[PDB]
Amino acid sequence: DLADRFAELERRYDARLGVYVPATGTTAAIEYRADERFAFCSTFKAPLVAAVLHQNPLTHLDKLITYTSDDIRSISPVAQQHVQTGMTIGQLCDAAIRYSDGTAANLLLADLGGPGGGTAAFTGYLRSLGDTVSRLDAEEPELNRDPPGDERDTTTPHAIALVLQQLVLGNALPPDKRALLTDWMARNTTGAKRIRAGFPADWKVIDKTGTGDYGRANDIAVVWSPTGVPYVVAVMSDRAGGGYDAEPREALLAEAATCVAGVLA
Numbered sequence: 001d002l003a004d005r006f007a008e009l010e011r012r013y014d015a016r017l018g019v020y021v022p023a024t025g026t027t028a029a030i031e032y033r034a035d036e037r038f039a040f041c042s043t044f045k046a047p048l049v050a051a052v053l054h055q056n057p058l059t060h061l062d063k064l065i066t067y068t069s070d071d072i073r074s075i076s077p078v079a080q081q082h083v084q085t086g087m088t089i090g091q092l093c094d095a096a097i098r099y100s101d102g103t104a105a106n107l108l109l110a111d112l113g114g115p116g117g118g119t120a121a122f123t124g125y126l127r128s129l130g131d132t133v134s135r136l137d138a139e140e141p142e143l144n145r146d147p148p149g150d151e152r153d154t155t156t157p158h159a160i161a162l163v164l165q166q167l168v169l170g171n172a173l174p175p176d177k178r179a180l181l182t183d184w185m186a187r188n189t190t191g192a193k194r195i196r197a198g199f200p201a202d203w204k205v206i207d208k209t210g211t212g213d214y215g216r217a218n219d220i221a222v223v224w225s226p227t228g229v230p231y232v233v234a235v236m237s238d239r240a241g242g243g244y245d246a247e248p249r250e251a252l253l254a255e256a257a258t259c260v261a262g263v264l265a
Contacts, residue, residue, distance in 0.1 A: 005259050006032040013252040015215065018236040020157035021260060022165055027231070030260060034161075037133075037154040038236035041144045041210030043220050044122070044136055044155075045096040045105050046185065050167045051125035052093060052108050053177040061090030061180075065107050074102030074140040097184040097208055102140030109139055129166050133159040144212035148240035160220055161234040168206070168222045169230055182206060185222070193250040194219035195233055198257020202226040215239025215246030219253050223264075231264055233257065 010017050018038050021030035052060075066086040072079060078095035079087065080103075087095065092108055095101035109118030112125075119136045126134050134155035136143065143153040155163075166172040168182055185206035194217070196205045203223050210218035218236040225231075235253050239246040 002030065002259060002263065003032060006256065009252055009255055009259075013237075013239065013249045014241050015237050015239045015249060015252055017252065017256060018157040018234075019256055019260065020161040020234045021264070022161055022232050024229075024231065026229075027264065030263060031158070034158040035156050037151060037156055038218065038238060039144065039146060039153055039210070039212055039214075039216055040134070040136065040155050040160075041212040041216050041218055042100045042102075042105075043160060043208050043210035043218050043236075044143070045100060046181070046208040046220065047126060047129075047163055047167060048105060048108050048112075048122055049093045049097055049184065050173060050177075050181055051112055051122055052089065053173060053180060054125070055112065056089075058176065061088060061093070063089045065089060065092060065111070067103065067107060071106070072103050073106060076101045076103035079103035079107075093180070094184055097181075098188050098190075100190050100209060100211075106139050126163060129163050129172055131155075131159050131163050134163070144210075144216065145244075148214050148238060157234040157236050160236075161232045164220050164222065164234070165232045169232070182222075191219055191221070194253040195221040195223070195235060195257040197250075197254035198259075199223055199261045200226075203261070210236075211248050212238075213244045213246075215242055215248050217248035217250055217253055219257075225264065233260055235260075 019032040020034040023029040077099040092104040095104040112118040112121040114121040137152040191207040207221035
C-alpha cells in the first residue's frame with residue numbers, strides 16, 4: 001500500500017516525491033517515481049568528494065587551497081570563515097558534506113579539472129560507476145535553480161541510490177578512502193529533519209541533503225538497522241506548482257522516510 005501513501009503525501013504537500021531503496025538479499029526494492037529526474041541540488045556533493053578521493057593520494061587532502069571573498073557564490077557556512085587562511089582539500093571535503101558548503105563544492109569541482117569547471121569530470125566519474133542517467137551541468141548556486149522539467153543538473157532516485165550504494169557499501173573506493181566519506185556523512189549537520197527524522201533512534205543514519213528553489217528538498221542516506229543490516233535510501237522532492245519561490249518541505253521527507261522505516265523494520 002506504499003504507492004497510495006506516497007501519493008497521499010504528494011497531495012498533502014502539493015509536491016512531487018521520488019523514493020528508491022535498493023533490493024537487498026532479503027528485501028525487495030522500494031520505488032516511487034524512482035526513474036523520474038529530480039535536481040541533485042547538494043546531494044551531488046557526496047559523490048563529488050568520492051571523485052576527489054578516488055583520483056588522488058591521501059596526501060592530497062593536506063593541500064591548501066586559497067580563494068577570495070568573490071569566489072563565495074553560494075551558501076558556504078565553512079568557507080565564509082576561511083578566506084584569509086584558505087582551506088585544505090580535506091577541509092573542503094568535510095565542509096562540502098557536513099555543512100553542504102557550496103564554495104567548498106565549487107573548489108572541489110575545480111580540483112577535478114577539465115571543461116565546465118569540473119562538471120564534465122564529475123559527470124564522467126558517475127559514468128565510471130555505471131550511472132548513465134545523471135548529469136551535472138552547472139556549479140553552485142546555479143545548479144539548484146534550473147526550471148522543473150529541465151534535464152540539466154538532474155539525477156533520479158534510482159540512479160543516485162545505486163551510486164551511493166557503491167560508494168559506501170560497495171568497493172568504489174578502497175577501505176581507507178571509503179571510511180573518510182562514510183565518516184563525513186555520519187557527522188552531517190544538515191539532515192536532522194529529513195531521513196533521520198523518519199528512522200527510530202536505534203537505527204544509524206548517514207546522509208547528504210539537497211535543497212533548492214521550486215520547493216526542492218532531497219536527502220540520500222545509508223541506514224543500519226538495530227542489528228546492523230544496511231539499506232540505502234534516496235528521497236527527492238519538489239513543489240513546482242508553487243513556482244520558483246515555493247518553500248521546501250522537510251516534513252515530506254521525514255514522512256516518506258517514516259513509511260520506508262516501517263517497511264524495513
